[PDB]
Design an enzyme around this catalytic site. Structure first.
Site, PDB file in Angstrom:
ATOM      1  CG  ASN A 125      -7.758  -0.140   7.699  1.00 53.20           C
ATOM      2  OD1 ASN A 125      -6.565   0.123   7.556  1.00 53.20           O
ATOM      3  ND2 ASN A 125      -8.482  -0.735   6.752  1.00 53.20           N
ATOM      4  CG  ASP A 132     -10.169  -3.705   4.655  1.00 56.84           C
ATOM      5  OD1 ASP A 132     -10.561  -4.741   5.237  1.00 56.84           O
ATOM      6  OD2 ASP A 132      -8.991  -3.573   4.248  1.00 56.84           O
ATOM      7  CB  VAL A 140       2.737   5.355   6.866  1.00 52.73           C
ATOM      8  CG1 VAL A 140       2.220   6.484   7.774  1.00 52.73           C
ATOM      9  CG2 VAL A 140       1.641   4.825   5.954  1.00 52.73           C
ATOM     10  CE1 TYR A 156       0.972  -1.013   4.328  1.00 52.42           C
ATOM     11  CE2 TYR A 156       0.872   1.375   4.253  1.00 52.42           C
ATOM     12  CZ  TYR A 156       1.272   0.221   4.870  1.00 52.42           C
ATOM     13  OH  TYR A 156       1.971   0.304   6.046  1.00 52.42           O
ATOM     14  CE  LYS A 177      -2.251   6.092   2.065  1.00 54.49           C
ATOM     15  NZ  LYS A 177      -2.260   5.931   0.564  1.00 54.49           N
TER      16      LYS A 177
HETATM   17  C1  LIG Z   1      -0.718   8.686   6.386  1.00 55.27           C
HETATM   18  C2  LIG Z   1      -2.174   8.203   6.146  1.00 55.27           C
HETATM   19  C3  LIG Z   1      -2.886   8.625   5.025  1.00 55.27           C
HETATM   20  C4  LIG Z   1      -4.213   8.201   4.824  1.00 55.27           C
HETATM   21  C5  LIG Z   1      -4.831   7.323   5.741  1.00 55.27           C
HETATM   22  O1  LIG Z   1      -6.198   6.874   5.527  1.00 55.27           O
HETATM   23  C6  LIG Z   1      -4.137   6.888   6.856  1.00 55.27           C
HETATM   24  C7  LIG Z   1      -4.832   5.941   7.842  1.00 55.27           C
HETATM   25  C8  LIG Z   1      -2.811   7.333   7.059  1.00 55.27           C
HETATM   26  C9  LIG Z   1      -2.052   6.785   8.259  1.00 55.27           C
HETATM   27  C10 LIG Z   1      -1.579   5.471   8.082  1.00 55.27           C
HETATM   28  C11 LIG Z   1      -0.862   4.848   9.097  1.00 55.27           C
HETATM   29  C12 LIG Z   1      -0.398   3.398   8.913  1.00 55.27           C
HETATM   30  C13 LIG Z   1       0.649   2.827   9.676  1.00 55.27           C
HETATM   31  C14 LIG Z   1       0.960   1.490   9.458  1.00 55.27           C
HETATM   32  N1  LIG Z   1       0.263   0.743   8.553  1.00 55.27           N
HETATM   33  C15 LIG Z   1      -0.735   1.238   7.840  1.00 55.27           C
HETATM   34  N2  LIG Z   1      -1.415   0.354   6.942  1.00 55.27           N
HETATM   35  C16 LIG Z   1      -2.196   0.925   5.877  1.00 55.27           C
HETATM   36  C17 LIG Z   1      -3.707   0.896   6.171  1.00 55.27           C
HETATM   37  C18 LIG Z   1      -4.261  -0.524   6.087  1.00 55.27           C
HETATM   38  N3  LIG Z   1      -3.671  -1.436   7.028  1.00 55.27           N
HETATM   39  C19 LIG Z   1      -2.372  -1.900   6.617  1.00 55.27           C
HETATM   40  C20 LIG Z   1      -1.269  -1.063   7.269  1.00 55.27           C
HETATM   41  C21 LIG Z   1      -1.131   2.573   7.986  1.00 55.27           C
HETATM   42  C22 LIG Z   1      -0.619   5.515  10.312  1.00 55.27           C
HETATM   43  C23 LIG Z   1      -1.096   6.822  10.468  1.00 55.27           C
HETATM   44  C24 LIG Z   1      -0.806   7.539  11.808  1.00 55.27           C
HETATM   45  N4  LIG Z   1      -0.364   6.757  12.876  1.00 55.27           N
HETATM   46  O2  LIG Z   1      -0.963   8.739  11.918  1.00 55.27           O
HETATM   47  C25 LIG Z   1      -1.811   7.471   9.449  1.00 55.27           C
HETATM   48  N5  LIG Z   1      -2.300   8.800   9.631  1.00 55.27           N
END
Ligand SMILES: Cc1ccc(O)c(C)c1-c1cc(-c2ccnc(N3CCCNCC3)c2)cc(C(N)=O)c1N
Length: 273
Positions: free
Chosen positions: A155, A150, A43, A40, A58
Site C-alpha cells: 500500500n 492497513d 487498476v 478489490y 481503479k
Molecule cells: C487507482 C488507485 C485509487 C485509489 C488508491 O488508494 C490507490 C492506491 C490507487 C492505485 C492503486 C494501484 C495498485 C496496483 C496494484 N495493486 C493494488 N492493490 C490494491 C491496494 C491494496 N493492495 C493490494 C493490491 C493497487 C496503483 C496505483 C499507481 N501505481 O498509480 C494507484 N494510484
C-alpha cells in the site's frame, strides 16, 4: 438503457458525450496497461483525454449488490477526499459511478514497495527515505483525525527520486466500518479493538522491518507474539544498521501509550530532511 455516469464526492465532463454508448471510462481515457487486479478491483494506467496526462484508475469488479454495498464502496471516496492533497499520499483526482461500478482516478504512481522489493536486499539509504516519507504521510493523516489500518508494503507506492506515497484509503478510520488489515503488520492493541494514531506507526515499523530485512513476517503464533514484545528478534536484524534498529524499536513499542509519535520520529536527527 443505462443511467449517465455520476460524480462521487462527499463535499457537495470535458470531452465526454452522453449521446454515445461508450462508458465515461472508455470515452475519456486511453487504457495503457493493467497495474493490478484482485477482489478489490482492477487498476489501469491511463492517459486522460481531458488534459493529456497520465493517471491511474481503479474500478470495482462487480455492480453494487444493494444500497448498503454501494454505500460501503462509495465510502472509500469520502475517506480519500479527507486525505486530500499531500506529497506523500496518493492524490485522488475524481471519482464516479457508472453501471453500478465505482471508479477512482488518482495520480499515477510507481510500483508498490512490495513489488520494488520483490524485483530488487534494499540499500538502507532507500529504506530511510521510504520510512521518512511514509512517516510524513502518517503525520498528515493524524492531523485530519485519520488512522490507516492497513499500512503495508503493498500500500506504499514509489515516486520521483526515492519518494513514496501511502494509498488504499478504504482502510482508513476516523478518530466507521472497516475491513480487516493484514495480521502480519497489525498493532497488538487492535486485537482488543483498540486503535489510535499509534496503530499505524506500529504497522509502518513492521512494514519497514520487512522491506529492510527481506524476510516474511509471521501472520500468527509465537513468532507473531515475539515481534510484539518490545525487542527485535535476531532473525530479522541481520544486516540492519544500529541506527535503523533503534528507530524501528521505537515504533514497535507494544504499549500504544508509550509508542513514539510520527512527529517525534520525524524530529529525530537521523530523519532530518
Ligand atoms: C487507482 C488507485 C485509487 C485509489 C488508491 O488508494 C490507490 C492506491 C490507487 C492505485 C492503486 C494501484 C495498485 C496496483 C496494484 N495493486 C493494488 N492493490 C490494491 C491496494 C491494496 N493492495 C493490494 C493490491 C493497487 C496503483 C496505483 C499507481 N501505481 O498509480 C494507484 N494510484
Amino acid at each position: 438503457h443505462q443511467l449517465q455516469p455520476r460524480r462521487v464526492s462527499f463535499r457537495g465532463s470535458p470531452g465526454y458525450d452522453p449521446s454515445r454508448p461508450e462508458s465515461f471510462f472508455q470515452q475519456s481515457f486511453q487504457r495503457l496497461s493493467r497495474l493490478g487486479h484482485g477482489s478489490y478491483g482492477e487498476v489501469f494506467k491511463v492517459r486522460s483525454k481531458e488534459d493529456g496526462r497520465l493517471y491511474a484508475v481503479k474500478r470495482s469488479m462487480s455492480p453494487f449488490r444493494g444500497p448498503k454495498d454501494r454505500a460501503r464502496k462509495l465510502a472509500e471516496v469520502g475517506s480519500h477526499e479527507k486525505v486530500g492533497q499531500h506529497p506523500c499520499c496518493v492524490r485522488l483526482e475524481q471519482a464516479w459511478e457508472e453501471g453500478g461500478i465505482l471508479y477512482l482516478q488518482t495520480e499515477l504512481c510507481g510500483p508498490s514497495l512490495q513489488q520494488h522489493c520483490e524485483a530488487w536486499s534494499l540499500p538502507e539509504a532507500q529504506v530511510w527515505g521510504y520510512l521518512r516519507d511514509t512517516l510524513l504521510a502518517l503525520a498528515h493523516l493524524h492531523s485530519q483525525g485519520l488512522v490507516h489500518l492497513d499500512v503495508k508494503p503493498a500500500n506504499i507506492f514509489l515516486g520521483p527520486r526515492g519518494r513514496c506515497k501511502l494509498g488504499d484509503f478504504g482502510l482508513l478510520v476516523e478518530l466507521g466500518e472497516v475491513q480487516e488489515g493484514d495480521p502480519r503488520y497489525m498493532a497488538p492493541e487492535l486485537l482488543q479493538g483498540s486503535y489510535g494514531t499509534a496503530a499505524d506507526v506500529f504497522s509502518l515499523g513492521l512494514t519497514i522491518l520487512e522491506v529492510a530485512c527481506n524476510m516474511e513476517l509471521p501472520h500468527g503464533g509465537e513468532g507473531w507474539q515475539q515481534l510484539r514484545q518490545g525487542y527485535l528478534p535476531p532473525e530479522f536484524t541481520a544486516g540492519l544498521s544500529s541506527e535503523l534498529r533503534s528507530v524501528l524499536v521505537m515504533m514497535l513499542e507494544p504499549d500504544p501509550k508509550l509508542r513514539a509519535t510520527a512527529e517525534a520520529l520525524l524530529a529525530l536527527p537521523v530523519l532530518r530532511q
